[PDB]
């Protein structure tokens, strides 16, 4: 098996447009995810609220949906609750709240998509492991 | 308990003074060779 463009092709928006990624961008978005997010989201779980993971299926049923890049990039600017009714940038890192979450201050728009595509790619690779927790380690 | 506490404190103290004063009593001279 290898890292291919069909692997690296993830939903861009909910209109079913897609985008294909490079080796460089997936690895780029792995590094940034490690840097900025994995302290809480290692392997697709959420340590501080294990009821919400980054499985693409969970991301799908979010309001708004987040199983695409634009939805994810938006969440990283203006995060909401699962159901969409509450902005939570006061506690969840985001560009909006980069004055209290410093690690976000220097993230470019090209960076947030790198991370989103990583998130959307990684479960194509690992399947159940991603978002599964220790049962699958 | 109070009684027990006081008795343990005194016991511990007595034993600790024996120890300090024993090594202060020219412990370096006590040996089978040169008495400094």
């Amino acid at each position: 098996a290898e890292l291919t463009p069909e692997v690296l092709t993830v939903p861009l928006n909910s209109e079913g447009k897609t985008i294909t990624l490079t080796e460089k961008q997936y690895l780029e978005g792995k590094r940034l995810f490690q840097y900025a997010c994995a302290s809480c989201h290692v392997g697709g779980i959420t340590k501080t609220n294990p009821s919400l993971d980054l499985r693409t299926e969970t991301l799908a049923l979010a309001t708004p949906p987040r199983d695409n890049i634009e939805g994810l990039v938006d969440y990283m600017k203006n995060p909401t609750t699962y159901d969409g009714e509450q902005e939570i940038a006061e506690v969840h890192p985001s560009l909006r709240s980069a004055d209290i979450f410093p690690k976000m201050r220097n993230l470019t728009e090209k960076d947030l998509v790198a991370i989103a595509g990583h998130i959307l790619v990684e479960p194509k690779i690992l399947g159940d492991k991603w978002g599964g927790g220790k049962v699958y380690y | 308990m109070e009684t027990l506490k006081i008795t343990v404190y005194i016991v511990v103290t007595f034993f600790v003074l024996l120890f300090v004063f024993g090594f202060l009593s020219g412990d370096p001279a006590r040996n089978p060779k040169r008495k400094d």
Binding site: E2, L3, K129, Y137 | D27, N31
Partner: protein, 334 residues
């Protein structure tokens, strides 16, 4: 002369069957207290709520244990690191429940064993000896401080010290592996080399001295009577043992200096054991063993398990089952 001096001379007397000394003045009463409390608790102590969850663990023979399952049980997690003398309890009944005998025993013992060490120095000074035996004993002593003192400190509770029991000791080892991966720690690898290598060199030194005993007896008597005590001369030909072992391997892998040979035998296990006790003492602060879980992956990103990944599945089963009613939240942070 005067009283204080007649007593000082009795204390430091080299004619007592057992040396007392000033270290011995602290050692004796504290070992006596530890030993008497331990014998009574092992036999008769009622159950002890070790994990602070009102789930008492029976450790004593009269409450259904045998020699292998019994133990004096660590004090409760609700105590954590607080001092808990008998006088701090409202009743012996409370004290027994919350695990007080464990605190009484390990402090009197740690204290009395540290003075054992000083006593070894003290009698060597009265005897005109070189002083460093006590240095060797410091390797076991240090190991005991680790499981009974240092590890509770780093983890915030004497409830996580080693139990005073055969099975309780295994309990402590298994939970240590899940929470720290001690098998993957180099200091414990240094400890195994410590004691395998010690036993090796023990079997070797004995086997090679016994091989080179000088015919002093006939075939019907123990060879052992070929040695008499305090005899001026040696009872084995070291030149002969070097010639045998120097050829078993090669000539310079073999010791021919008696002094170099014994210092080697002292230093190997002492150092190794220093390292494994240093290793328990630094895992007390959660600086844990090597972690190579999901360290090998293929072109696409699939995890190619190694033996380290199999170890982690074991570790994980210990992790999720230990202290099964004691965790309310998803991480076990101490």
């Amino acid at each position: 002369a005067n009283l204080w001096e007649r007593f000082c001379n009795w204390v430091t007397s080299t004619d007592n069957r057992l040396y007392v000394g000033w270290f011995g003045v602290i050692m004796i009463p504290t070992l006596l207290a530890a030993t008497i409390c331990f014998v009574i608790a092992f036999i008769a102590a009622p159950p002890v709520d070790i994990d602070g969850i009102r789930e008492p663990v029976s450790g004593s023979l009269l409450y259904g244990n045998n020699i292998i399952t019994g133990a004096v049980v660590p004090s409760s997690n609700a105590i954590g690191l607080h001092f808990y003398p008998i006088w701090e309890a409202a009743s012996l009944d409370e004290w027994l429940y919350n695990g007080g005998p464990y605190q009484l025993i390990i402090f009197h013992f740690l204290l009395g064993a540290s003075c054992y060490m000083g006593r070894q120095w003290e009698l060597s000074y009265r005897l005109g000896m070189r002083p460093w035996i006590c240095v060797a004993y410091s390797a076991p002593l240090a190991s005991a401080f680790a499981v009974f003192l240092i590890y509770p400190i780093g983890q915030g509770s004497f409830s996580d010290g080693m139990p005073l029991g055969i099975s309780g000791t295994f309990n402590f080892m298994i939970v240590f592996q899940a929470e720290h991966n001690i098998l993957m720690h180099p200091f414990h690898q240094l400890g195994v080399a410590g004691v395998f290598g010690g036993a090796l060199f023990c079997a070797m030194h004995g086997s090679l001295v016994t091989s080179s005993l000088i015919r002093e007896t006939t075939e019907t008597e123990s060879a052992n009577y070929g040695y008499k005590f305090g005899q001026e001369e040696e009872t084995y030909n070291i030149v002969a043992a070097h010639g045998y072992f120097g050829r078993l391997i090669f000539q310079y892998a073999s010791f021919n200096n008696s002094r170099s040979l014994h210092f080697f035998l002292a230093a190997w296990p002492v150092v190794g054991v220093w390292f494994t006790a240093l290793g328990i003492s630094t895992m007390a602060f959660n600086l844990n063993g090597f972690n190579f879980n999901h360290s090998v992956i293929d072109a696409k990103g699939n995890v190619i398990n190694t033996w380290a990944d199999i170890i982690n599945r074991a570790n994980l089963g210990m992790e999720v089952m230990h202290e099964r009613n004691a965790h309310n939240f998803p991480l076990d942070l101490a």
